[PDB]
């Protein structure tokens, strides 16, 4: 699969596409990479951040770190971001202490996935 930067350069995640439909089987499932050696078993949740509806509804939002690569069976975005607006989704790693990498302009969550208008 293909990766992208984060706001924490210790972790990276999937290229979640520009604009997608409210609650779809993602076109590429969500990989989250541990460069810093993480105990393969640690939990990773995500929280969709946006000035509008600050905590959107998500599904299979929790995942397990395994071989330094936490994968989400199939994450799904339900709570819509709004017009032009995307999610600065937060990414938690359950450790002592836990760590987060913010991720601005992640994905635009509308009811239609971008049809040919």
């Amino acid at each position: 699969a293909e990766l992208v930067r984060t706001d924490s350069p210790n972790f990276l995640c999937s290229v979640l596409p520009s604009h997608w439909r409210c609650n779809k089987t993602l076109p590429v499932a969500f990989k989250v990479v541990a460069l810093g050696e993480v105990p393969d078993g640690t939990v990773v949740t995500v929280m969709a951040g946006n000035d509008e509806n600050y905590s959107a509804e998500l599904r299979n939002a929790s995942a397990v770190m395994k071989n330094q690569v936490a994968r989400f069976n199939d994450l799904r975005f339900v709570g819509r971001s709004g017009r032009g607006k995307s999610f600065t989704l937060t990414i938690t790693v359950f450790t002592n202490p836990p760590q987060v990498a913010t991720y601005h302009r992640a994905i635009k969550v509308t009811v239609d996935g971008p049809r040919e208008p």
Partner: protein, 121 residues
């Protein structure tokens, strides 16, 4: 590396951190599809356990918190009635109405851990 070399600099340079350095509008994000009564109990029982999910409404930034290294200075329900008082992007950093499940909060650079963590290199 768990943290960035210029740990102090990033906090005092990044728009992301300084936008959260001031006292901002926060709210409880846990169990959004649940009645106001259930959300009130869940949030309180979780705070007592030393964990919750609060997000800066204004900016959009969500967080899952852990009030630890039960505690005292991390989760106090006495400082005021009807309310209660990590490594973010490689930067060591550190109230909600028990009825409304909303309130105010902010980030503060952790000089202590920033040294301890920087020393592990």
């Amino acid at each position: 590396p768990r943290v960035v070399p210029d740990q102090r600099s990033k906090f005092e340079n990044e728009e992301f951190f300084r936008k959260l350095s001031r006292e901002c509008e926060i709210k409880y994000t846990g169990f959004r599809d649940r009645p106001h009564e259930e959300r009130q109990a869940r949030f309180q029982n979780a705070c007592r356990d030393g964990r919750s999910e609060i997000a800066f409404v204004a900016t959009g930034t969500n967080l899952s918190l852990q009030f630890f290294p039960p505690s005292r200075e991390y989760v106090d329900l006495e400082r005021e009635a009807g309310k209660v008082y990590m490594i973010l992007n490689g930067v060591c950093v550190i109230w909600i109405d028990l009825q409304r499940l909303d309130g105010m909060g902010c980030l503060e650079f952790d000089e202590e851990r920033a040294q301890q963590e920087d020393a592990l290199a």
